[PDB]
């Protein structure tokens, strides 16, 4: 019943906890659907109350509100923009310093979904000061929080060259290069994901990846037994090889040609074609 959504939004002002939790679950439920469902939640006026609940001292209420905002931020760019225009970003950035790992994880989920939108939505994340907090979380001992910070930084690095350069200017490259030494393979995969998105920009952004010293580690990861890590390193290297001759020359000087020509005989047909295309990009001019 469409009449239930305004009543659900009305229950967001309820002094009772279980009424509040029930309405937040329904909103989080509806926002689990398509954009049409998320649009009905927004049109019911749920965003202003949801943003206010980000200041709740109750741990369970803050988690349910973050999960509802997270799911709404998984919609279209204009629905992500409604989340931005409702004022959610300053609270999410503040929540990036919370000692509660459950709260911090959910705040990272919402920020990552917002950063999954267009360049206008990614720039709002940048302008709210999310980057230096995200870069700081790359030093977290929690492997789960570390993955969430990599997911958020990768989505920000999925925008235009201006958004990619903001990630570089925030000092994310030295932490990403060091994460290539991680024995944890799912963290190592997310770091390659972020580096590949950064290396997909212009020659300035590609040279910044080279200047951070990422090439020796990327070349070594071409010998990884994990074919997912092997491919991600191959994708990151081929993005770097797409740059100018100075960029291709650094890839060759890192010894990538020997491994790339070997990977043409790899047992995976997909890897063979990517190694072949990387060698094509390495032809100068």
């Amino acid at each position: 019943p469409g009449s239930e959504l305004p009543q659900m939004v009305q229950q967001l002002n309820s002094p009772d906890q279980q009424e509040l939790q029930s309405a937040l679950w329904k909103l989080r439920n509806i926002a689990s659907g398509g954009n049409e469902q998320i649009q009905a939640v927004i049109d019911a006026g749920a965003l202003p109350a949801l943003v206010q609940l980000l200041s709740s001292p109750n741990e369970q209420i803050l988690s349910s509100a973050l999960g509802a905002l997270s799911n709404i931020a998984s919609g279209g760019n204009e629905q992500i923009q409604a989340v931005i225009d409702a004022g959610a970003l300053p609270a999410l950035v503040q929540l990036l310093s919370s000692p509660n790992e459950q709260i911090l994880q959910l705040a990272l989920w919402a920020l990552s979904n917002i950063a999954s939108g267009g360049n206008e939505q990614i720039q709002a994340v940048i302008d709210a000061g999310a980057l230096p907090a995200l870069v700081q979380l790359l030093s977290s001992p929690n492997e789960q929080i570390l993955q969430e910070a990599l997911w958020a930084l990768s989505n920000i690095a999925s925008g235009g060259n201006e958004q990619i350069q903001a990630v570089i200017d925030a000092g994310a490259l030295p932490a990403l290069v060091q994460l290539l030494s991680s024995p944890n393979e799912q963290i190592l995969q997310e770091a390659l994901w972020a580096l590949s998105n950064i290396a997909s920009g212009g020659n300035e952004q590609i040279q910044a990846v080279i200047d951070a010293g990422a090439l020796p580690a990327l070349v070594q990861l071409l010998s990884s037994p994990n074919e997912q890590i092997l491919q991600e390193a191959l994708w990151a290297l081929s993005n770097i090889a797409s740059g100018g001759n100075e960029q291709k020359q650094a890839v060759k000087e890192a010894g990538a040609l020997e491994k790339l020509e070997q990977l043409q005989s790899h047992e995976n047909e997909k890897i063979q074609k990517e190694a072949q295309e990387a060698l094509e990009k390495l032809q100068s001019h």
């Binding site: 926002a31 689990s32 999960g67 997270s70 999954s116 690095a157 999925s158 994708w235």
Partner: peptide, 12 residues
């Protein structure tokens, strides 16, 4: 490689 975005929905 292209630039890859990732959205996630919660089930709880």
């Amino acid at each position: 490689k292209r630039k890859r975005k990732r959205k996630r929905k919660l089930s709880f």
